[PDB]
Amino acid sequence: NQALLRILKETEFKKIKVLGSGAFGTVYKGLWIPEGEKVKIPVAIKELREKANKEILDEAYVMASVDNPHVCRLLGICLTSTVQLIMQLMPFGCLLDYVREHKDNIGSQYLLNWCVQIAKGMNYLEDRRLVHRDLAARNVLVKTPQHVKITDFGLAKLLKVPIKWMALESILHRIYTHQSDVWSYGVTVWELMTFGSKPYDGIPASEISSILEKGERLPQPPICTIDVYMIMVKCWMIDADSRPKFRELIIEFSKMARDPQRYLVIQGDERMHLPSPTDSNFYRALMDEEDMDDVVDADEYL
Numbered sequence: 001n002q003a004l005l006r007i008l009k010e011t012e013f014k015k016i017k018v019l020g021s022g023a024f025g026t027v028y029k030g031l032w033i034p035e036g037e038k039v040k041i042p043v044a045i046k047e048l049r050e051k052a053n054k055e056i057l058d059e060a061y062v063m064a065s066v067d068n069p070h071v072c073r074l075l076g077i078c079l080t081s082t083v084q085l086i087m088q089l090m091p092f093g094c095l096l097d098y099v100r101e102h103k104d105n106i107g108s109q110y111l112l113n114w115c116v117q118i119a120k121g122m123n124y125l126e127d128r129r130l131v132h133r134d135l136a137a138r139n140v141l142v143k144t145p146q147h148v149k150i151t152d153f154g155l156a157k158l159l160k161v162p163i164k165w166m167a168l169e170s171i172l173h174r175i176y177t178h179q180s181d182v183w184s185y186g187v188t189v190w191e192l193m194t195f196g197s198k199p200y201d202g203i204p205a206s207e208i209s210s211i212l213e214k215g216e217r218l219p220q221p222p223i224c225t226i227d228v229y230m231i232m233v234k235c236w237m238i239d240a241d242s243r244p245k246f247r248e249l250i251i252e253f254s255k256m257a258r259d260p261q262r263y264l265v266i267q268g269d270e271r272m273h274l275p276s277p278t279d280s281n282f283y284r285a286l287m288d289e290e291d292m293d294d295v296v297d298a299d300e301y302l
Ligand SMILES: */C=C\C(=O)N1CCC[C@@H](n2nc(-c3ccc(Oc4ccccc4)cc3)c3c(N)ncnc32)C1
Pocket: 019, 020, 021, 027, 044, 045, 046, 063, 072, 073, 074, 085, 086, 087, 088, 089, 090, 091, 093, 094, 095, 096, 097, 137, 138, 139, 141, 151, 152, 153, 154, 155
């Protein structure tokens, strides 16, 4: 579906501010102004650091074809000897920055729900027989605090390797599968549960395969019950086929979401809440009108 990707002229948009800079590229806050109109519409622009345009376009069409509440869809592209990718601007930013900023005051309901949502997005990709190759907290965007979407799908294929998120088989032989995606998902969950901690920090990348072969793993976060830690451990099993499936993960986390205090131990959690319906309705109307499955709420509390 070529209609899904908009080809943008340089004249119809402008980069206004740098939001972040990456090995993959630089991300800018931008404005689209549509031809013949007086409106300036905020957009996010990713300019890749630096394959012919035909190959790039062909990859781009697939990237534009992902349509799920929990995956970000590439909206537009401009090809000018630099590759510029256009998507919605998300004021909330990446999940990783968000958890660090809120590290004191994030509730168990949010964390479990984020786990469900990410799994839902990954599952959609698996169902489509597509592999992300770079799942990480940095690569999840926050639409609203209640709603998160996986981003940068297909970028890894298109283009400093994230060794510390990679499955052993990926590090060793660069084999990427839904099962390697599951491994990355586990690291991502660990990031959330540690409020933005950097996995294997201080361990050189060159040693990572060896420690994994030894069987060393990321440690259990203090907030996590063993039940949650075991799910991460299952994600990092050497035999890829043994690892959990995204469809299973959606169910497990959803179950946990029903009695959060059973599975995550957080100080003052009783004080921290998912939004009331009134608040949720307000957020959706203002900035999140797309259809999504309702957040899983505690059985006790509704
Ligand atoms: C934790 C991530 C981080 O540090 N960032 C730096 C600041 C910007 C932030 N960010 N990135 C995007 C973003 C992501 C992807 C794309 O383009 C795509 C889309 C789909 C597939 C491949 C490439 C563009 C922009 C942000 C957006 N969209 N809004 C707000 N912050 C974004 C990452």
